[PDB]
Amino acid sequence: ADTIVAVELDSYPNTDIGDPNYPHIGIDIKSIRSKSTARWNMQTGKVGTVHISYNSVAKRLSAVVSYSGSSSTTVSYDVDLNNVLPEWVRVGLSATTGLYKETNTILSWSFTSKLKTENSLHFSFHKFSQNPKDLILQGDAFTDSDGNLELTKVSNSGDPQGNSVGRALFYAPVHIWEKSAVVASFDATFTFLIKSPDREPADGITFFIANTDTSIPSGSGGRLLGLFPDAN
Amino acid sequence: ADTIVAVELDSYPNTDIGDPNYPHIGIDIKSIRSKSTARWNMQTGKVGTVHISYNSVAKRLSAVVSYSGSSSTTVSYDVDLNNVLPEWVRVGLSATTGLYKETNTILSWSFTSKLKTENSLHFSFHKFSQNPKDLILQGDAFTDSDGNLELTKVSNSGDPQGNSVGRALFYAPVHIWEKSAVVASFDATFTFLIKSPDREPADGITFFIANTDTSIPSGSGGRLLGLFPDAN
Amino acid sequence: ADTIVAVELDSYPNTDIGDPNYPHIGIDIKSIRSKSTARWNMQTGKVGTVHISYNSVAKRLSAVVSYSGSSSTTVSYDVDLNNVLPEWVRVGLSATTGLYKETNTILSWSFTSKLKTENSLHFSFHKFSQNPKDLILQGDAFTDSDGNLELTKVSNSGDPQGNSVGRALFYAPVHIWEKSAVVASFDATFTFLIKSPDREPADGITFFIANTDTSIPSGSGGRLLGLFPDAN
Amino acid sequence: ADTIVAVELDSYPNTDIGDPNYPHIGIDIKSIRSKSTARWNMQTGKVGTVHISYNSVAKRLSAVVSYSGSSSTTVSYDVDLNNVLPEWVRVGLSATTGLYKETNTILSWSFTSKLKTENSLHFSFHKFSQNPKDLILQGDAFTDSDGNLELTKVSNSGDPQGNSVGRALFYAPVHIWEKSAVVASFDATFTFLIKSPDREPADGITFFIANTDTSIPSGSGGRLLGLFPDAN
Ligand SMILES: OC[C@H]1O[C@H](Oc2c[nH]c3ccc(Br)c(Cl)c23)[C@@H](O)[C@@H](O)[C@@H]1O
Ligand SMILES: OC[C@H]1O[C@H](Oc2c[nH]c3ccc(Br)c(Cl)c23)[C@@H](O)[C@@H](O)[C@@H]1O
Ligand SMILES: OC[C@H]1O[C@H](Oc2c[nH]c3ccc(Br)c(Cl)c23)[C@@H](O)[C@@H](O)[C@@H]1O
Ligand SMILES: OC[C@H]1O[C@H](Oc2c[nH]c3ccc(Br)c(Cl)c23)[C@@H](O)[C@@H](O)[C@@H]1O
Ligand SMILES: [Ca+2]
Ligand SMILES: [Ca+2]
Ligand SMILES: [Ca+2]
Ligand SMILES: [Ca+2]
Ligand SMILES: [Cl-]
Ligand SMILES: [Cl-]
Ligand SMILES: [Cl-]
Ligand SMILES: [Cl-]
Ligand SMILES: [Mn+2]
Ligand SMILES: [Mn+2]
Ligand SMILES: [Mn+2]
Ligand SMILES: [Mn+2]
């Protein structure tokens, strides 16, 4: 099984598997059951922005989501990710739909990792090309004619389809920590557009870090966000 | 009086003004009396590296100092710096000597600030030019013929002089936070060479953030590190 | 008199002082009389993007302007800028109106300089704050309530006023070259909105590099773009 | 056959296949026979630094090599690399030895590509880990216990072996240009240590850009630098 650290943008409350009452942002450490959540006041139909950051000295993984001119929602969790992830990881974005749906559109994605022992990896996408060679697209993930990364199935009219899962992994493995490292840090930004007809959009988007060979776990559909094989 | 947030590399223990027993790294918030310290196992005569970071979401100011192949020393302090500093600051490095001395040599200095509401300021020096126009040199601060930033007086033979104070401020004011900011962050690295004849080198080096018009406070000598007018 | 290297976005053709027949982008080296121009097919009312780059090895200063989904316009000029500018410069944006006008709105501005002998300065603005401490605003330059940098006078209704001049200089001087430098390079991006009622918008926008103490030359109005005291 | 754009650091003059009389830096466009060369005054046993840059507006690929406090050697070649390379490439470093040898030690390697239509890829290595997951090591390429990238075979005593070829490719494919691109640019730095017993060190090091599936061509040994299958 994969090792997952994720920041989830969870549009759909699954209280029966640990979710709070409402859409929330969450820090997921090896379980869909968030270690820390904050209430996410969704603005379906508007472009959202997520900023994620961590450094191995502060050991605080923090995420903030906002829309233009809105209140931001922040969530934090003290965690030494060295105890969780392998030295070499891949970073990615995942999304699902289930019984309920939403577009899981990524409009931009950037990521900077740094490893002082100064090693560094930065990538940033504003356009996604029709054939992203530097992306590993998994499942229903695809780039559309607007150069948007669509993590989950969307029809031609642009209606999201349910029971879809998809992710994009940056092609290059990231060295997020190392024995002699004095400090490893990473930051990530993605902007997203969740549109839905359902009065309860589902299921969400995550930025995630995993073992380099990470694949979509069987049964990771819907509330599991394409990240976990079960709700444990 | 100036508003100071600093990370101090305090070679000299002044227990009578709050210092612990030993050389320490410290997070200073508006007082030379550190909110958080860690024991700093000095390696006088060796090049040291300090990494400082903070973002307004995690609200954890963290610093780590190390020498090649040594144990690092980290120190952290949870603090919303918005409650401390004005929106616009200058960043700088300060050093002092007093009764006891040490060279306060800066070999490199870099700083990245970011302000999402994405505004950004990055500077990095590996060489310091004989006339640093982008630096505001205060007190005894000067760049030498090796292109090294010497914060405190050093003779021609290169012996440090006591009772010296000096700082370098990056010329451009940094906008470290702002009303609409969703997340402001900064990182700073400097490398330093502290050499001393004294069996107790003094007094230390800091990276600091202050009101843009920050100047060396009268009586900020020695244990006060060129940052504070008193030990309160 | 100031030393000017500029890339001009010249909305208004002044053939009587060297301009070609039409709006053009130009590389200006110590004269409003461009060393190289390209025809600039203006799209008044649309957001434009200028990319400027140079490195001291290739010695090719190049600029490209485009609007979304349009043909770009590029202009180049082989020049060792070491022979032109002093070691320490300030970078800025200038605009003018004269008999004819246009808004000279800067929506973003970034600049990266690098100096290997690796010294570096990066700044990028997407918002401009009401009081830009890191900007030196000259003349009619001001930031508006949209966080836009307006180089020239615009009324409350947002109509541009004629006979206006204004510039913004990044506060920190840039070390663009140095005796021991192996390679100095800089890149600059700004995005701009030129709106005009006049069927001939005037007078233009430039990104420019100048002696650090650069000020708006008397008589630099209109076709002189706030950069030169005469048309020589 | 692969499509190669390379900057060669050619320690060994092979005049019978187009080389000038002496060690040279060269811009190679789809042939080991450089389009442009400059005399490279080698400093075997000293750490060298190569800076490579290009942008699609200036269309000038330029490289400079230097050692601390030495005269630099620059070479340029006007070329639209869009006419040469496919949209998606991999960047790498190659080295060979043949009858004569040298260590082909890479101490650092960084690369920034940018694609405005702002997409971007930056990586920088100062240490190379024992298992570089983000590097595709080809042939004799390996990282040693000093965290140095050794492109060609070096014995335990650290003596280079002849008839060796090796390269490291950054794992992630780079999108170096694209139909809608307004400007694509890349910069690359690597530092290298060439040590040799031979009074004629061979054969050299290159930074290269190639089709993503680039492999070491059969017969690319020695003077062909692991880049070309023949000397045509
Ligand atoms: O898209 C939202 C959800 O729909 C599915 O579960 C449902 C949530 N509301 C329901 C009501 C009835 C039935 Br049957 C089901 Cl499966 C569900 C599942 O796919 C969930 O994993 C998912 O989170
Ligand atoms: O350089 C170290 C220190 O020397 C001075 O205080 C002294 C520390 N040891 C002493 C012993 C005697 C006397 Br008098 C003095 Cl001032 C000191 C002062 O300058 C201090 O601020 C400083 O920290
Ligand atoms: O804004 C465009 C121009 O207007 C002025 O010159 C005029 C261009 N068309 C004209 C026609 C008549 C007279 Br009088 C004048 Cl000054 C001009 C001047 O301010 C110029 O510098 C400028 O380029
Ligand atoms: O390392 C340097 C060179 O050695 C080989 O060619 C030789 C250059 N000097 C020679 C002298 C005699 C013979 Br046989 C050979 Cl193959 C060579 C070949 O491996 C070349 O490709 C290479 O550039
Ligand atoms: Ca859920
Ligand atoms: Ca002290
Ligand atoms: Ca004109
Ligand atoms: Ca050769
Ligand atoms: Cl339901
Ligand atoms: Cl004492
Ligand atoms: Cl007229
Ligand atoms: Cl021979
Ligand atoms: Mn959840
Ligand atoms: Mn102290
Ligand atoms: Mn003109
Ligand atoms: Mn050659």
PDB file of N, CA and C in Angstrom, chain C residues 51 53-55 57-60 62-70 72 74-76 78 112 114 116-118 181-183 185 187 189, chain D residues 51 53-55 57-60 62-70 72 74-76 78 112 114 116-118 181-183 185 187 189:
ATOM      1  N   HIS C  51       8.020  40.872 -22.264  1.00  0.00           N
ATOM      2  CA  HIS C  51       9.142  40.140 -21.684  1.00  0.00           C
ATOM      3  C   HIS C  51      10.448  40.708 -22.220  1.00  0.00           C
ATOM      4  N   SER C  53      14.769  40.569 -21.837  1.00  0.00           N
ATOM      5  CA  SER C  53      15.878  39.777 -21.345  1.00  0.00           C
ATOM      6  C   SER C  53      17.190  40.162 -21.999  1.00  0.00           C
ATOM      7  N   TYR C  54      18.268  39.840 -21.300  1.00  0.00           N
ATOM      8  CA  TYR C  54      19.612  40.153 -21.722  1.00  0.00           C
ATOM      9  C   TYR C  54      20.545  39.356 -20.833  1.00  0.00           C
ATOM     10  N   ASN C  55      21.650  38.897 -21.405  1.00  0.00           N
ATOM     11  CA  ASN C  55      22.763  38.436 -20.592  1.00  0.00           C
ATOM     12  C   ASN C  55      24.049  38.894 -21.252  1.00  0.00           C
ATOM     13  N   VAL C  57      26.789  37.600 -21.865  1.00  0.00           N
ATOM     14  CA  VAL C  57      27.528  36.704 -22.740  1.00  0.00           C
ATOM     15  C   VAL C  57      26.996  36.816 -24.169  1.00  0.00           C
ATOM     16  N   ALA C  58      25.685  36.657 -24.327  1.00  0.00           N
ATOM     17  CA  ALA C  58      25.055  36.817 -25.635  1.00  0.00           C
ATOM     18  C   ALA C  58      25.036  38.278 -26.069  1.00  0.00           C
ATOM     19  N   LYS C  59      24.973  39.186 -25.102  1.00  0.00           N
ATOM     20  CA  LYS C  59      24.946  40.609 -25.408  1.00  0.00           C
ATOM     21  C   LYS C  59      23.818  40.924 -26.385  1.00  0.00           C
ATOM     22  N   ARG C  60      22.670  40.299 -26.167  1.00  0.00           N
ATOM     23  CA  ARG C  60      21.507  40.606 -26.972  1.00  0.00           C
ATOM     24  C   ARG C  60      20.357  40.996 -26.057  1.00  0.00           C
ATOM     25  N   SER C  62      16.675  41.766 -25.707  1.00  0.00           N
ATOM     26  CA  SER C  62      15.530  41.389 -26.508  1.00  0.00           C
ATOM     27  C   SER C  62      14.251  41.620 -25.726  1.00  0.00           C
ATOM     28  N   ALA C  63      13.224  42.048 -26.449  1.00  0.00           N
ATOM     29  CA  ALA C  63      11.927  42.336 -25.861  1.00  0.00           C
ATOM     30  C   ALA C  63      10.868  41.732 -26.757  1.00  0.00           C
ATOM     31  N   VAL C  64       9.791  41.254 -26.151  1.00  0.00           N
ATOM     32  CA  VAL C  64       8.661  40.736 -26.900  1.00  0.00           C
ATOM     33  C   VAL C  64       7.405  41.235 -26.220  1.00  0.00           C
ATOM     34  N   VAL C  65       6.446  41.708 -27.010  1.00  0.00           N
ATOM     35  CA  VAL C  65       5.148  42.118 -26.478  1.00  0.00           C
ATOM     36  C   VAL C  65       4.052  41.293 -27.137  1.00  0.00           C
ATOM     37  N   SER C  66       3.058  40.905 -26.350  1.00  0.00           N
ATOM     38  CA  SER C  66       1.932  40.167 -26.888  1.00  0.00           C
ATOM     39  C   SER C  66       0.678  40.405 -26.074  1.00  0.00           C
ATOM     40  N   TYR C  67      -0.445  40.046 -26.676  1.00  0.00           N
ATOM     41  CA  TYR C  67      -1.715  40.015 -25.992  1.00  0.00           C
ATOM     42  C   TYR C  67      -2.173  38.571 -26.140  1.00  0.00           C
ATOM     43  N   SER C  68      -3.091  38.130 -25.290  1.00  0.00           N
ATOM     44  CA  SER C  68      -3.564  36.746 -25.354  1.00  0.00           C
ATOM     45  C   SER C  68      -4.038  36.357 -26.757  1.00  0.00           C
ATOM     46  N   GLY C  69      -3.476  35.274 -27.292  1.00  0.00           N
ATOM     47  CA  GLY C  69      -3.904  34.729 -28.570  1.00  0.00           C
ATOM     48  C   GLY C  69      -3.571  35.586 -29.776  1.00  0.00           C
ATOM     49  N   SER C  70      -2.649  36.522 -29.594  1.00  0.00           N
ATOM     50  CA  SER C  70      -2.231  37.396 -30.682  1.00  0.00           C
ATOM     51  C   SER C  70      -0.863  37.008 -31.215  1.00  0.00           C
ATOM     52  N   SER C  72       2.884  37.854 -31.455  1.00  0.00           N
ATOM     53  CA  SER C  72       3.791  38.617 -30.612  1.00  0.00           C
ATOM     54  C   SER C  72       4.595  39.564 -31.488  1.00  0.00           C
ATOM     55  N   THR C  74       8.479  41.014 -31.475  1.00  0.00           N
ATOM     56  CA  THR C  74       9.780  40.931 -30.836  1.00  0.00           C
ATOM     57  C   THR C  74      10.725  41.967 -31.423  1.00  0.00           C
ATOM     58  N   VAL C  75      11.667  42.429 -30.618  1.00  0.00           N
ATOM     59  CA  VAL C  75      12.695  43.323 -31.117  1.00  0.00           C
ATOM     60  C   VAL C  75      13.983  42.992 -30.401  1.00  0.00           C
ATOM     61  N   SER C  76      15.088  43.020 -31.133  1.00  0.00           N
ATOM     62  CA  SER C  76      16.382  42.724 -30.539  1.00  0.00           C
ATOM     63  C   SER C  76      17.431  43.732 -30.953  1.00  0.00           C
ATOM     64  N   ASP C  78      21.872  43.831 -30.496  1.00  0.00           N
ATOM     65  CA  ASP C  78      23.133  43.390 -29.928  1.00  0.00           C
ATOM     66  C   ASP C  78      23.837  44.575 -29.275  1.00  0.00           C
ATOM     67  N   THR C 112      14.293  39.915 -12.602  1.00  0.00           N
ATOM     68  CA  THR C 112      15.320  39.068 -12.024  1.00  0.00           C
ATOM     69  C   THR C 112      16.660  39.482 -12.599  1.00  0.00           C
ATOM     70  N   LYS C 114      20.928  38.663 -12.168  1.00  0.00           N
ATOM     71  CA  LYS C 114      21.863  37.690 -11.642  1.00  0.00           C
ATOM     72  C   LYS C 114      23.263  38.131 -11.999  1.00  0.00           C
ATOM     73  N   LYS C 116      27.001  36.424 -11.736  1.00  0.00           N
ATOM     74  CA  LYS C 116      28.036  35.439 -11.441  1.00  0.00           C
ATOM     75  C   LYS C 116      29.408  36.044 -11.611  1.00  0.00           C
ATOM     76  N   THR C 117      30.267  35.766 -10.642  1.00  0.00           N
ATOM     77  CA  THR C 117      31.643  36.211 -10.660  1.00  0.00           C
ATOM     78  C   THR C 117      32.540  34.997 -10.427  1.00  0.00           C
ATOM     79  N   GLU C 118      27.209  33.708  -7.221  1.00  0.00           N
ATOM     80  CA  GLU C 118      25.906  33.981  -7.815  1.00  0.00           C
ATOM     81  C   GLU C 118      25.158  34.980  -6.959  1.00  0.00           C
ATOM     82  N   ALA C 181      32.730  39.933 -12.860  1.00  0.00           N
ATOM     83  CA  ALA C 181      31.571  39.215 -13.324  1.00  0.00           C
ATOM     84  C   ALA C 181      31.926  38.336 -14.456  1.00  0.00           C
ATOM     85  N   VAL C 182      31.475  37.097 -14.389  1.00  0.00           N
ATOM     86  CA  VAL C 182      31.623  36.174 -15.509  1.00  0.00           C
ATOM     87  C   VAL C 182      30.412  36.310 -16.428  1.00  0.00           C
ATOM     88  N   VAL C 183      29.245  36.473 -15.817  1.00  0.00           N
ATOM     89  CA  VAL C 183      28.027  36.743 -16.563  1.00  0.00           C
ATOM     90  C   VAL C 183      26.997  37.449 -15.689  1.00  0.00           C
ATOM     91  N   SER C 185      23.025  38.909 -15.977  1.00  0.00           N
ATOM     92  CA  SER C 185      21.835  38.799 -16.793  1.00  0.00           C
ATOM     93  C   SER C 185      20.684  39.422 -16.041  1.00  0.00           C
ATOM     94  N   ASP C 187      16.156  39.625 -16.466  1.00  0.00           N
ATOM     95  CA  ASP C 187      14.916  39.448 -17.197  1.00  0.00           C
ATOM     96  C   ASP C 187      13.893  40.351 -16.529  1.00  0.00           C
ATOM     97  N   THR C 189       9.505  41.223 -16.693  1.00  0.00           N
ATOM     98  CA  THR C 189       8.182  41.114 -17.265  1.00  0.00           C
ATOM     99  C   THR C 189       7.316  42.204 -16.671  1.00  0.00           C
TER     100      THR C 189
ATOM    101  N   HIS D  51      28.164  28.304 -17.548  1.00  0.00           N
ATOM    102  CA  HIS D  51      26.829  28.891 -17.604  1.00  0.00           C
ATOM    103  C   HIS D  51      26.324  28.867 -19.038  1.00  0.00           C
ATOM    104  N   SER D  53      22.877  29.601 -21.572  1.00  0.00           N
ATOM    105  CA  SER D  53      21.598  30.277 -21.644  1.00  0.00           C
ATOM    106  C   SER D  53      21.132  30.468 -23.074  1.00  0.00           C
ATOM    107  N   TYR D  54      19.825  30.634 -23.210  1.00  0.00           N
ATOM    108  CA  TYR D  54      19.172  30.790 -24.487  1.00  0.00           C
ATOM    109  C   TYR D  54      17.761  31.262 -24.200  1.00  0.00           C
ATOM    110  N   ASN D  55      17.241  32.119 -25.068  1.00  0.00           N
ATOM    111  CA  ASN D  55      15.809  32.363 -25.095  1.00  0.00           C
ATOM    112  C   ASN D  55      15.380  32.488 -26.544  1.00  0.00           C
ATOM    113  N   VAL D  57      13.537  34.391 -28.137  1.00  0.00           N
ATOM    114  CA  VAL D  57      13.405  35.700 -28.757  1.00  0.00           C
ATOM    115  C   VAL D  57      14.751  36.141 -29.332  1.00  0.00           C
ATOM    116  N   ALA D  58      15.787  36.114 -28.499  1.00  0.00           N
ATOM    117  CA  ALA D  58      17.135  36.442 -28.957  1.00  0.00           C
ATOM    118  C   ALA D  58      17.698  35.350 -29.860  1.00  0.00           C
ATOM    119  N   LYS D  59      17.276  34.112 -29.632  1.00  0.00           N
ATOM    120  CA  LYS D  59      17.753  32.995 -30.435  1.00  0.00           C
ATOM    121  C   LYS D  59      19.277  32.949 -30.433  1.00  0.00           C
ATOM    122  N   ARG D  60      19.864  33.193 -29.270  1.00  0.00           N
ATOM    123  CA  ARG D  60      21.300  33.072 -29.137  1.00  0.00           C
ATOM    124  C   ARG D  60      21.616  32.115 -27.998  1.00  0.00           C
ATOM    125  N   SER D  62      24.228  30.617 -25.717  1.00  0.00           N
ATOM    126  CA  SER D  62      25.524  31.097 -25.289  1.00  0.00           C
ATOM    127  C   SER D  62      25.993  30.315 -24.077  1.00  0.00           C
ATOM    128  N   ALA D  63      27.298  30.076 -24.036  1.00  0.00           N
ATOM    129  CA  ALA D  63      27.917  29.328 -22.956  1.00  0.00           C
ATOM    130  C   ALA D  63      29.172  30.065 -22.541  1.00  0.00           C
ATOM    131  N   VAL D  64      29.479  30.019 -21.253  1.00  0.00           N
ATOM    132  CA  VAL D  64      30.704  30.603 -20.740  1.00  0.00           C
ATOM    133  C   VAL D  64      31.271  29.636 -19.725  1.00  0.00           C
ATOM    134  N   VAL D  65      32.578  29.398 -19.790  1.00  0.00           N
ATOM    135  CA  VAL D  65      33.256  28.568 -18.798  1.00  0.00           C
ATOM    136  C   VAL D  65      34.343  29.386 -18.115  1.00  0.00           C
ATOM    137  N   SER D  66      34.487  29.197 -16.811  1.00  0.00           N
ATOM    138  CA  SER D  66      35.532  29.879 -16.074  1.00  0.00           C
ATOM    139  C   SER D  66      35.962  29.081 -14.862  1.00  0.00           C
ATOM    140  N   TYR D  67      37.116  29.461 -14.335  1.00  0.00           N
ATOM    141  CA  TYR D  67      37.595  28.954 -13.071  1.00  0.00           C
ATOM    142  C   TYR D  67      37.767  30.204 -12.219  1.00  0.00           C
ATOM    143  N   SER D  68      37.804  30.047 -10.903  1.00  0.00           N
ATOM    144  CA  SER D  68      37.943  31.204 -10.017  1.00  0.00           C
ATOM    145  C   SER D  68      39.139  32.083 -10.390  1.00  0.00           C
ATOM    146  N   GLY D  69      38.881  33.372 -10.603  1.00  0.00           N
ATOM    147  CA  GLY D  69      39.933  34.342 -10.861  1.00  0.00           C
ATOM    148  C   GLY D  69      40.633  34.187 -12.197  1.00  0.00           C
ATOM    149  N   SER D  70      40.007  33.452 -13.106  1.00  0.00           N
ATOM    150  CA  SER D  70      40.571  33.245 -14.434  1.00  0.00           C
ATOM    151  C   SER D  70      39.845  34.070 -15.483  1.00  0.00           C
ATOM    152  N   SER D  72      37.405  34.112 -18.459  1.00  0.00           N
ATOM    153  CA  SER D  72      36.326  33.232 -18.877  1.00  0.00           C
ATOM    154  C   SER D  72      36.480  32.937 -20.360  1.00  0.00           C
ATOM    155  N   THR D  74      33.884  32.362 -23.540  1.00  0.00           N
ATOM    156  CA  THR D  74      32.495  32.386 -23.964  1.00  0.00           C
ATOM    157  C   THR D  74      32.374  31.909 -25.403  1.00  0.00           C
ATOM    158  N   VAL D  75      31.238  31.315 -25.733  1.00  0.00           N
ATOM    159  CA  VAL D  75      30.973  30.940 -27.109  1.00  0.00           C
ATOM    160  C   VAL D  75      29.499  31.144 -27.368  1.00  0.00           C
ATOM    161  N   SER D  76      29.173  31.645 -28.551  1.00  0.00           N
ATOM    162  CA  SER D  76      27.780  31.875 -28.903  1.00  0.00           C
ATOM    163  C   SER D  76      27.463  31.364 -30.291  1.00  0.00           C
ATOM    164  N   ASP D  78      23.923  31.878 -32.964  1.00  0.00           N
ATOM    165  CA  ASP D  78      22.546  32.239 -33.246  1.00  0.00           C
ATOM    166  C   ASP D  78      21.815  31.037 -33.836  1.00  0.00           C
ATOM    167  N   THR D 112      17.061  25.979 -15.326  1.00  0.00           N
ATOM    168  CA  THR D 112      15.776  26.650 -15.268  1.00  0.00           C
ATOM    169  C   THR D 112      15.244  26.785 -16.682  1.00  0.00           C
ATOM    170  N   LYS D 114      11.681  28.084 -18.848  1.00  0.00           N
ATOM    171  CA  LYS D 114      10.475  28.872 -18.706  1.00  0.00           C
ATOM    172  C   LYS D 114       9.761  28.898 -20.037  1.00  0.00           C
ATOM    173  N   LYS D 116       6.536  30.953 -21.564  1.00  0.00           N
ATOM    174  CA  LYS D 116       5.406  31.874 -21.623  1.00  0.00           C
ATOM    175  C   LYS D 116       4.620  31.666 -22.895  1.00  0.00           C
ATOM    176  N   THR D 117       3.304  31.634 -22.741  1.00  0.00           N
ATOM    177  CA  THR D 117       2.386  31.501 -23.851  1.00  0.00           C
ATOM    178  C   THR D 117       1.356  32.624 -23.756  1.00  0.00           C
ATOM    179  N   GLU D 118       2.937  31.365 -17.733  1.00  0.00           N
ATOM    180  CA  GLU D 118       4.331  31.154 -17.364  1.00  0.00           C
ATOM    181  C   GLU D 118       4.501  29.761 -16.796  1.00  0.00           C
ATOM    182  N   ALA D 181       3.702  29.412 -27.564  1.00  0.00           N
ATOM    183  CA  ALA D 181       4.727  30.039 -26.768  1.00  0.00           C
ATOM    184  C   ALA D 181       5.049  31.378 -27.301  1.00  0.00           C
ATOM    185  N   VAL D 182       5.112  32.353 -26.414  1.00  0.00           N
ATOM    186  CA  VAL D 182       5.569  33.687 -26.785  1.00  0.00           C
ATOM    187  C   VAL D 182       7.084  33.758 -26.614  1.00  0.00           C
ATOM    188  N   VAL D 183       7.570  33.132 -25.548  1.00  0.00           N
ATOM    189  CA  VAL D 183       9.002  33.007 -25.327  1.00  0.00           C
ATOM    190  C   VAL D 183       9.313  31.813 -24.433  1.00  0.00           C
ATOM    191  N   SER D 185      12.681  29.942 -22.658  1.00  0.00           N
ATOM    192  CA  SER D 185      14.068  30.186 -22.328  1.00  0.00           C
ATOM    193  C   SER D 185      14.533  29.097 -21.393  1.00  0.00           C
ATOM    194  N   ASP D 187      18.171  28.289 -18.778  1.00  0.00           N
ATOM    195  CA  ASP D 187      19.528  28.545 -18.334  1.00  0.00           C
ATOM    196  C   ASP D 187      20.005  27.271 -17.658  1.00  0.00           C
ATOM    197  N   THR D 189      23.490  25.786 -15.273  1.00  0.00           N
ATOM    198  CA  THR D 189      24.816  25.897 -14.708  1.00  0.00           C
ATOM    199  C   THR D 189      25.260  24.520 -14.263  1.00  0.00           C
TER     200      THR D 189
END
